[PDB]
């Protein structure tokens, strides 16, 4: 009931460039009164799952830090963005913790991220030697070695670049179309509350 300066949710949900899945562009939503009713006026969403909290009771809760990471993911891979899920884009690109307290918002972007010849600017990691820890990020493009012969930094017959493209085309059926995902998180570990509701 004392809204002063709403958080820039329109700078997170309504943006022209969304990063790849191995990048996050995490934004610290802080030092501003958060009105969680503005998220419903940006676009028609296709997935809205709040793990731990309630979408209606989000307005009357205080937190120490709210984060908002965004990335473009395939349609068949939205089901992997969930606490305790295994998969290609859930073990090597984005691992949500099993104690996740937040919301995962996903919506289609076929009219903005699909050119007739396919857009190869959205890259995804296929495999690593290990699995990512919760909330970890890898931008290293070290060439993979699928064989017994060492690879001296050149993509060859057995040496592979770790990042592959999606190739989003408008003719692909629903499932291979771009889906922009904005995962909201909340922290209350040890800090004063600075991100409250309209109050």
């Amino acid at each position: 009931p004392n809204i002063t300066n709403l958080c820039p949710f329109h700078e997170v949900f309504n943006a022209t460039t969304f990063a790849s899945v191995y990048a996050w562009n995490r934004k610290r939503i802080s030092n501003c009164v958060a009105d969680y009713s503005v998220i419903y006026n940006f676009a028609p969403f296709f997935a809205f799952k709040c793990y731990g909290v309630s979408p209606t009771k989000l307005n009357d809760l205080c937190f120490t830090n709210v984060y908002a990471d965004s990335f473009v993911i395939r349609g068949n891979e939205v089901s992997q963005i969930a606490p305790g899920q295994t998969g290609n884009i859930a073990d090597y690109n984005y691992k949500l913790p099993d104690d996740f307290t937040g919301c995962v918002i996903a919506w289609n972007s076929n009219k903005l991220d699909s050119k007739p010849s396919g857009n190869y600017n959205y890259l995804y990691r296929l495999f690593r030697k290990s699995k990512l820890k919760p909330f970890e990020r890898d931008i290293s493009t070290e060439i993979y070695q699928a064989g017994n012969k060492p690879c001296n930094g050149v993509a060859g017959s057995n040496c592979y670049s770790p990042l592959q493209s999606y190739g989003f085309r408008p003719t692909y059926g629903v499932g291979h179309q771009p889906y922009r995902v904005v995962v909201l998180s909340f922290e209350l570990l040890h800090a004063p509350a600075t991100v409250c509701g309209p109050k």
Partner: single-chain antibody, 235 residues
Framework: VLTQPPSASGTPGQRVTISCSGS????????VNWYQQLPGTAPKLLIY???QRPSGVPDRFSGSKSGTSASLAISGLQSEDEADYYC??????????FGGGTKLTVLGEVQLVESGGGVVQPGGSLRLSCAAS????????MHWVRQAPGKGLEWVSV????????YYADSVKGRFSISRDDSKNSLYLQMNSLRTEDTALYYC????????????????????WGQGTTVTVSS
């Protein structure tokens, strides 16, 4: 279970409201879908995502989801708005729960065809197939909604476009098996050990989303229905 007034009424020209309450597991966490079924026809989707309507539904129908309850506002009802309106939500217990039906009584292309029915010798089995033509079958999900004669809608099974996930109701779990064939454009439902309480029409409902309603909990809705196959399992 979604509680709903069993019968509402109104005069032609006034706006009536049909409420539908629910727990924090179905409406509070997911979206509400309102349907309309004239006497002797198949249901049609009115409002999805609690505030959105397809092209066919006029603007007179309004929706609103305030907390864990929903409301269907029919502004200026005509003589043709005399039917039973149902609510729909996806409970987090992996089941599609319907309402009870509200008999609104006034005081004044894509084709889904299904076959396979008859007496089932209550303890036998029966095969149900649903033909499909003209909506990119591999992209939309499929459903199975049966309705006893004179009763409400009951959800049976669901299968996503990929076919990986498949959910069943608690009363048809372990006895029914759903499947799809993307090459033949057909939806199958194998019924085994049919009991005396499985007499219904078994509509074949085509969903508008791709994934199951658990992952896409803000887009699901049964757009195109079909003419059900009245099974008559009896002695």
């Amino acid at each position: 279970v979604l509680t709903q007034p069993p019968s509402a009424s109104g005069t032609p020209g006034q706006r009536v409201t049909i409420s539908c309450s629910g727990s924090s597991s179905n409406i509070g966490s997911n979206t509400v879908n309102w349907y309309q079924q004239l006497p002797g026809t198949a249901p049609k989707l009115l409002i999805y995502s609690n505030n959105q309507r397809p092209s066919g539904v006029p603007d007179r129908f309004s929706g609103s989801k305030s907390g864990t309850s929903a409301s269907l506002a029919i502004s200026g009802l005509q003589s043709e708005d005399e039917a039973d309106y149902y609510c729909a939500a996806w409970d987090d217990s992996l089941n599609w729960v319907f309402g009870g039906g509200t008999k609104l009584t006034v005081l004044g292309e894509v084709q889904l065809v299904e076959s396979g029915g008859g007496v089932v010798q209550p303890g036998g089995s029966l095969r149900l197939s649903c033909a499909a033509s003209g909506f990119r079958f591999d992209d939309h999900a499929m459903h199975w909604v049966r309705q006893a004669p004179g009763k409400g809608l009951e959800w049976v099974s669901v299968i996503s476009g990929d076919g990986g996930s498949t959910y069943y109701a608690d009363s048809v779990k372990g006895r029914f098996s759903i499947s799809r064939d993307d090459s033949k454009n057909s939806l199958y439902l194998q019924m085994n050990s049919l009991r005396t309480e499985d007499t219904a029409l078994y509509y074949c409902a085509k969903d508008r989303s791709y994934g199951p309603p658990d992952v896409f909990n803000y887009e699901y809705g049964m757009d195109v229905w079909g003419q059900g196959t009245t099974v008559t399992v009896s002695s």
